[PDB]
Design a protein around this ligand. Sequence first.
Ligand code: HEM
Ligand SMILES: COc1ccc2[nH]c(C(=O)N3C[C@@H](CCl)c4c3ccc3[nH]ccc43)cc2c1
Length: 469
Amino acid sequence: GLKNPPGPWGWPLIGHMLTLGKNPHLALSRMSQQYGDVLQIRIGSTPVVVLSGLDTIRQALVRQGDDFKGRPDLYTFTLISNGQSMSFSPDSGPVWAARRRLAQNGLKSFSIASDPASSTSCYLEEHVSKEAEVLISTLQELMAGPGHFNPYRYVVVSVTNVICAICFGRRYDHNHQELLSLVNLNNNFGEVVGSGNPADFIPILRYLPNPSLNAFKDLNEKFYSFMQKMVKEHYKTFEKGHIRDITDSLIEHCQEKQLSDEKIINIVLDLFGAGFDTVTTAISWSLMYLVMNPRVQRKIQEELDTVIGRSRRPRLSDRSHLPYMEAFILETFRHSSFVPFTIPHSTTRDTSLKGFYIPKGRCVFVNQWQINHDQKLWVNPSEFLPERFLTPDGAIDKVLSEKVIIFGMGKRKCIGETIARWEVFLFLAILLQRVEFSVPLGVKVDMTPIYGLTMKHACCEHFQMQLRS
Ligand code: HEM
Ligand SMILES: COc1ccc2[nH]c(C(=O)N3C[C@@H](CCl)c4c3ccc3[nH]ccc43)cc2c1
């Protein structure tokens, strides 16, 4: 038959806003244990259905994909890309799918396709090798200097120049101030649009003195200013036959052609933003796990010494033949789950899920964190143990690696998964082959994640690095 989704009691005006608290991913996981994989809360007066369970989510996002492919009409999204963001706009219909096809093509055309200037590698491998070595020599300068560094500061530039080369054909010095301007100055994007923001559900918090949202509104049109001054710089030097960027890839499509040319050109912003921010957090988390688990660091290097040695620079060729790193990366994604919730979803129409009615327009949270820490899928899920993914013969258990959910599911799946998987692998491979990372004893290193759409960690200034052998 049909039932309504269960759920706990909530306050008549604010709902469950206080039981979510500072860490919705944790509050809604405990709630799932009691009420199950399909439950119901209210943030203010706005109902929300929360989805947990590996297969319950797969059933909704994949098997009933177009019932669950929408995006809710939340305020914070209206301030992203002038209210016309592909990834955050309410547009779910054909206008959206088209822009998604243009971003998928522009991505693979200037990332995995072979570089004309190299018979060896693809675009992505060239860029990541360049920044990987610049980053190493940069980091050495700092041990010669202060003797210690915060890695996030310099990884964010090296990561950004990769996605900045795929998109704008330009890179920036590690101290270019108009860049830290963008990517390393009051970047609270993730913390504001993380699922459950009070300002999206409490209409008066948008008008009261809100520093966190004033910083947010200035960040987004400071990024929209950057985009317009790089596409105008590109149309001044654009040549029909020779496409250099993803930007020129879209300028081309504007010429060939409800699909505004604004809606085509501001796609590169969604790529540039998700590119630099997410991959950076992954690498930064990986290095926070290497410092705090030296055993895992050496066994990564031990594998690199036996499968490639120190005679040659690693390549994407070697990704398939390095199982223990694929395990470390998978466990960095799983233990941290630095993307605890997908971007909120919305129902396109009345539908049902595991026997529960959900009407059209209902806001939906997808608790990826709950999957990666479900104690019935993982033995000891709070422990960082990459070995959990390795078979008795030292290979990757592919069925258990496909239970790690961090790139979403269904028709709204991340379109930069393989880029992020290759970029994260290559960066870590080139660095760990030639250097080791360390934090002296007696220093504080808070591993506690900070909630957000992409959870970050507390800044750590005490990283050290020395070369090997
Ligand atoms: C570890 C790195 C990354 C993670 C964990 C990640 C995660 C996600 C998640 C959870 C979603 C939304 C899922 C949903 O809405 O159901 C998403 C969407 C998206 N991702 Fe990623 N992402 C990563 C890297 C990247 C990169 C490198 C790019 C571009 C080069 C990218 C581009 C996008 C875009 C454009 C969307 C919007 C898709 C849509 O809403 O239709 N992401 N990502
Ligand atoms: C869950 O991981 C995801 C999944 C989907 C995503 N989308 C985006 C994204 O579209 N943008 C747009 C862009 C402003 Cl247009 C921007 C971001 C993100 C951080 C940013 N910092 C400065 C600008 C900026 C990030 C992201 C992360």
